[PDB]
Amino acid sequence: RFASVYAWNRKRISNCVADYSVLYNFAPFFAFKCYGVSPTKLNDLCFTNVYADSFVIRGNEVSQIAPGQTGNIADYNYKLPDDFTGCVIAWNSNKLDSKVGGNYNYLYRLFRKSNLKPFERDISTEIYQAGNKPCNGVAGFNCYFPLRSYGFRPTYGVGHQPYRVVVLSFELLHAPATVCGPKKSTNLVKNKCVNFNFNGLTGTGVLTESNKKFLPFQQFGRDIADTTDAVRDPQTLEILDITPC
């Protein structure tokens, strides 16, 4: 079961190993677009959190699922932020959701009082007000039920066939990270020019025992110009200084 484009589902993924290979190697994923990240590199990265949003929409309507797009969905049902980093995965669902003159459970909002904000979600289905006349019950021009169903008929073409979509939103700052990929750790090397990959931060330099008092809530240290001056090991939590060879 997948939710409608309005009142879409949201699942938080944290504290686990993300094996994106089993996700990419799926056949029915006919559309797989990522922003700010390449699918081949997902297995080597680590994020601070992951949010999976799922819903069903028309076929060509999937073009509205992208940063800064315009349209019914992108404006009143589900809007992605301009700085979105993640992936949008879609696959056909005619064998699952389509019914001849049926499948009313999938709906979308046609109009709204104002444009929906990024990652917003309006659970209520109150009737839009027309203004020129009082509207307490059902009414005409502007006071129609805001939701209307797709009614996925198998006779419809690809332009109106049901497509199942799930958007993977990744937060990619450097705060406590917990969704790293299947990469394997390696014994630490100190006092030698070594290439390091600390919880996703990749660089080169010599690692030395730190002498600065990191507070228990801090995980990284920076000099002028965002230069990472220190880092704490995600395994033994010891603070290490980074100096260019």
């Epitope: 939710a3 001849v100 009313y104 459970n105 999938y106 039920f145 169903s149 009614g151």
Partner: antibody
Framework: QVQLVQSGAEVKKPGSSVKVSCKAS????????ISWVRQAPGQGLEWMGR????????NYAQKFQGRVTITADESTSTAYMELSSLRSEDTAVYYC????????????????WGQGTMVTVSS | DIQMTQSSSLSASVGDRVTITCRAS??????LAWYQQKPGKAPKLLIY???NLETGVPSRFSGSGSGTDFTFTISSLQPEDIATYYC?????????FGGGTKVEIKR
């Protein structure tokens, strides 16, 4: 919270038309969808049709079209059912249930059911 | 058209495990439900998704299967299980129900 109530029992002659309805109590008529299902003596449940009062979309079973007609409104907030040219075999109990497949990713199951309307045909 | 066949009458004593299946001619996409019903009364919905129970029914009732098969199961019978159960298909618009399996308390 949602609950349904049906009409009383009825008895009429063969070949005539029988009218029956169910009140769309609880919730709202806009957030509700009704569907009629037949249960004959010695048989399981059998579909008659579905109606969404707010969308106005309706359909029937492939063996009861014309013979069965479905209608609904909001002023009374009820689904109207009319069965024309009823046979003597049409002696059965009709049910009016909630159609969950109407909204929010639910599916075509009936979470709320009414009592039941017994329609009998005899001379 | 799509149809099904429950397989018709059962008898069991409190505590034992019973299983029932409703076969079909074409693979239902896990769109199958099961109801509890006294013969000639308003049914009560128990299973609507193949692996999700509704609110109000205890975990004693269960179900399994996918595709062109399904199996409804009661982990243990109790005196309240004197009723018939109906397998329902909702893969397409022409809704159809099963004949109804009836399990009787066994003395």
């Amino acid at each position: 919270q949602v609950q349904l109530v049906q009409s009383g029992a009825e008895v009429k002659k063969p070949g005539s038309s029988v009218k029956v309805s169910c009140k769309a109590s609880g919730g709202t008529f806009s957030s509700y969808a009704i569907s009629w299902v037949r249960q004959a003596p010695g048989q399981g449940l059998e579909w008659m049709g579905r109606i969404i009062p707010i969308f106005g979309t309706a359909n029937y079973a492939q063996k009861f079209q014309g013979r069965v007609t479905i209608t609904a409104d909001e002023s009374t907030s009820t689904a109207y059912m009319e069965l024309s040219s009823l046979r003597s075999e049409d002696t059965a109990v009709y049910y009016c249930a909630s159609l969950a497949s109407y909204s929010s990713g639910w599916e075509d199951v009936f979470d709320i059911w009414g009592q039941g309307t017994m329609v009998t045909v005899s001379s | 058209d799509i149809q099904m066949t429950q397989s018709s009458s059962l008898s069991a004593s409190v505590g034992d495990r019973v299983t029932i299946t409703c076969r079909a001619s074409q693979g239902i996409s896990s769109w199958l439900a099961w109801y509890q019903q006294k013969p000639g009364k308003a049914p009560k919905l128990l299973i609507y998704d193949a692996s999700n129970l509704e609110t109000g029914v205890p975990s004693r009732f269960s179900g399994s299967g996918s595709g062109t098969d399904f199996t409804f199961t009661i982990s243990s019978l109790q005196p309240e299980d004197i009723a018939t159960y109906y397998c329902q298909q909702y893969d397409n618009l022409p809704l159809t129900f099963g004949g109804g399996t009836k399990v009787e308390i066994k003395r």
